[PDB]
Assembly symmetry: D2
Homo-oligomer: 281 residues x 4
């Protein structure tokens, strides 16, 4: 009737040919986006190293590994890094970096694996747990909520948290959506991590379902061609009650705003909200 | 405005979430299949190693690397191996193996890179040449004829031949499509490169455009362990005919080479009784 | 990685249902345009009132649809010319006219296919109609993929250049000023019909309302539609320039005159205009 | 999640905007094509009218109505005609014609309704039967074999035969797919039902599933007056033997069945290879 016949199943690959969509105009521009932003801010390195060291943390778990940029740093600082991610296409880059530098004893002890928050417990042979777990770069917002009850989110944090050893730390952040939703416009290049050395026109698209923010989409453009990403607009208010219950209350919360601590009714409006937690009980 | 709107563009990934279609049912079963092909027959190893010694081939370029099964073997047998593929999804498994065995010196000198046949001259640094170039497992057939004049085929073969240094060897194969086209069905699961431990049922679809074969599509129905469970996936191939391919691979060297064809590791005499499942063309480059 | 179709998009063939003609979504949608083909006496009264007290007789419906609004004006001896861009909507108007072809009135009912964007060439007028109606919030159905409302200006410029001088134009649109604000579009407001679970989805691009989508439900199946959220403020300056200023613009709100800073918040804003010059 | 957000559900329309894909390039060229087929040959009219008189057939049911070309003819020639199709997009043109000529009494008594072969027993009120039932223009081939066992084909034929009253006539055809399958190409544009005033190039694609023909796809490249654009359609390639067997079985083997090869009787093995095969079946009772 009106069905469509595909040469190969979706998700399937074959020796000799590029995988599906591997080199469209959108993936190509996107490649440059994850490359022309694989640089870090001294302010960032300072803060991150600061927090981690002054906690006795050494065995760190990055659950938003990505191209490994944040882990490659902790690896150069002698930390015991375990980089993990659900995206094999993002991971390709972390691994490629580790192999190029396999001669450096540090990069030889760098564990890079594939894991999914939704099943992190079984995907990652932890056991002893880690001193610190990091999920920075606004990566958690990448996880949508197609279920409709944030349940998907609770499982993700419940799992991410049950990966930290008692008395352990958890640095999980997310952009400031309370502000983006309000202003409808999300500043382009207004980061605090990567030094934007690329041209980027960002078109913010918020979708409100029954008056409730449901999603934020960004269309990055450069010259003629563009690509897009979507995030779940998390409210600093709602994220907090959410990240804490993932621990079961047994946590010593604290929230920064672009590395500086945060006080409600504050004067400076943060670009990113970083939530740090010590797994008390 | 009738046009679907994307959460994220096609071919873009994001930390925290699985890539585009990696967790689908077809991808899942397809993964059980490429992990089953990971096991070659004793006859095959003997033939390939036999063939590569008989010419002193030391440096080998595997241009259809895949999960690295054949490459992993030549690496263990002392060869200088550089593997290459256009598919990151499959190359991922090769890299993973080379990493686990990074402590074995032979594996630390095993080069694995991404490269596409159509742009092989630029994707891989040679200039000199390779003792032997292999493209086995019926991989070349994955390349379709989009334009209709097999120009991509000639360009891919040309770039592939280019990698063979003078006096070099090129071993490339394809399934017997002369037989598949004639009977419309693909031989009774009997494979000679690998032992298929997994159970499968194969539906063959041939498409003919203006009476000229243009494509063969195989739908594999696998009995997944669990669920006696039945799920499936599909793959397509350009049905290369022995005559057509012999003509094409020679033309890639400029007709400047010695060319002989095997029928399942044994020499093939036109008209022979035994109908081969695969045809292996072995070409020695004049100079 | 191409996909292959047995037949092109838009093509039909003798013997088989057209593409998507009977999915679970179209089926529910059929009931939606059927379980709402009824009218409100308040509506009939207001519409007949306005039209008659203007000497209007030759009326042009540019949002014909299933013909429900025209079938009314036809039963009231008006000279009706029902037009629409949707052949699938029209199928219903025509089907009604043929069933009632014996009634001299329904035999003089002209039902054609026309597109606002090309109304000038699609509809042979020359003279101009006494009245033109585009009710039911139909104009909001036209999106703005162009990005500069230009598509909208052409639609009105054409819809207007279809009215004879001294002629009337009744074009309405739901109250989006309110929907955007409350995020929830009033579900089931008896002002046009008397028929569902509506899920409003607003999309703001760079802080600018860009679209409103409604997901209608029935129990285990649903369908959806999208509209351009027009602001009573922006629509006005828009509908007037389509005439070139030469018009006595007036705005109602649920069949009654509207006054800014009013107390009652309208469900629909009806814009009436007399083509002065 | 990698799902896509629709502006409107598939198959839903909205006043003011063109339906789903009505204004595309393929639809546009496809429209030039169905408006070109609107013109039958003198040989065809003579044969069909000949055939329908030779049996006294008065009430005729056209089960593959389309734009109503054949129906419009039988209406002019005095028959009692009820046309029917599953495609509203095509039925639109038939209705439009009947409306323009509503003043001609023959056209006011011309019934046109939507009905699907698979549900013909319920879609059309008969119970009694029709003198003759026609399904020409190689329309039955539009019905694909989704399930793989031709069950839909048997169900559609059965419902179609049902409409033929005892002593009735059923005229149904299909192109010569025995020839198309063998040579992989569709005959040199020579058509016998209609005069093709429009220029066309046809690429034929045959798909064989397990060595059994399953589909024929035609890509028509039309030389549009002005400015070369194209559209595609697919068909189930019915073989004469298979179809003869199927149409008889639809009557329960209770009927007389003869096949024509382009309006002329077909003797197996004849020299002239027909473009179309017309099966004419008289229903025993
Ligand atoms: C749609 N099809 C179909 C089905 N069965 C089911 N259940 N559903 C279907 O949709 N049976 C097979 C049939 C196959 N149809 C087609 C139509 C066109 C092409 C085609 O054009 N194929 C060429 C490429 C042409 C080009 O790239 O321009 C090919 O290599 O597949 C293939 C198969
Ligand atoms: C994908 N989505 C989704 C879901 N729920 C489920 N189950 N599955 C899904 O895929 N919830 C709604 C969400 C909607 N996402 C989006 C993303 C982008 C646009 C968008 O760009 N919309 C504009 C047009 C923009 C343009 O044309 O450039 C629009 O008018 O819809 C809309 C909705």
């Amino acid at each position: 009737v009106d069905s469509v016949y595909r040469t190969r199943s979706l998700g399937v690959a074959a020796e000799g040919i590029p995988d599906q969509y591997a080199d469209g105009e959108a993936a190509r521009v996107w490649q440059l986006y994850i490359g022309d932003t694989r640089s870090r801010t001294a302010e960032y390195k300072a803060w991150l190293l600061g927090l981690l060291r002054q906690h006795g943390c050494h065995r760190v778990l990055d659950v938003a590994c990505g191209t490994g940029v944040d882990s490659i740093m902790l690896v150069e600082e002698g930390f015991s890094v375990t980089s993990v991610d659900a995206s094999d296409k993002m991971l390709k880059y972390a691994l490629k970096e580790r192999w190029n530098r396999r001669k450096e004893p540090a990069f030889d002890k760098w564990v890079i694996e594939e894991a999914n928050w939704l099943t992190l417990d079984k995907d990652v042979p932890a056991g002893d747990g880690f001193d610190a777990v990091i999920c920075l770069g606004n990566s958690f917002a990448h996880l949508p909520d197609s279920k409709g009850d944030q349940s998907e989110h609770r499982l993700a944090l419940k799992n991410i948290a049950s990966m930290v050893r008692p008395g352990g730390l958890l640095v999980i952040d997310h952009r400031n959506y309370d502000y983006i939703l309000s202003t409808g416009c999300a500043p382009p290049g207004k980061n605090i991590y990567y030094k934007s050395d690329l041209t980027k026109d960002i078109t913010t698209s918020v979708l409100t379902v029954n008056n409730k923010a449901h999603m934020v989409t960004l269309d990055y453009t450069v010259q003629f061609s563009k690509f897009r990403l979507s995030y779940y607009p998390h409210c600093l208010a709602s994220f907090t009650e959410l990240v804490q219950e993932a621990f079961g209350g047994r946590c010593q919360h604290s929230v920064l705003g672009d590395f500086k601590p945060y006080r409600p009714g504050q004067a400076y409006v943060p670009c990113y909200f970083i939530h740090v937690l010590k797994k008390t009980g």
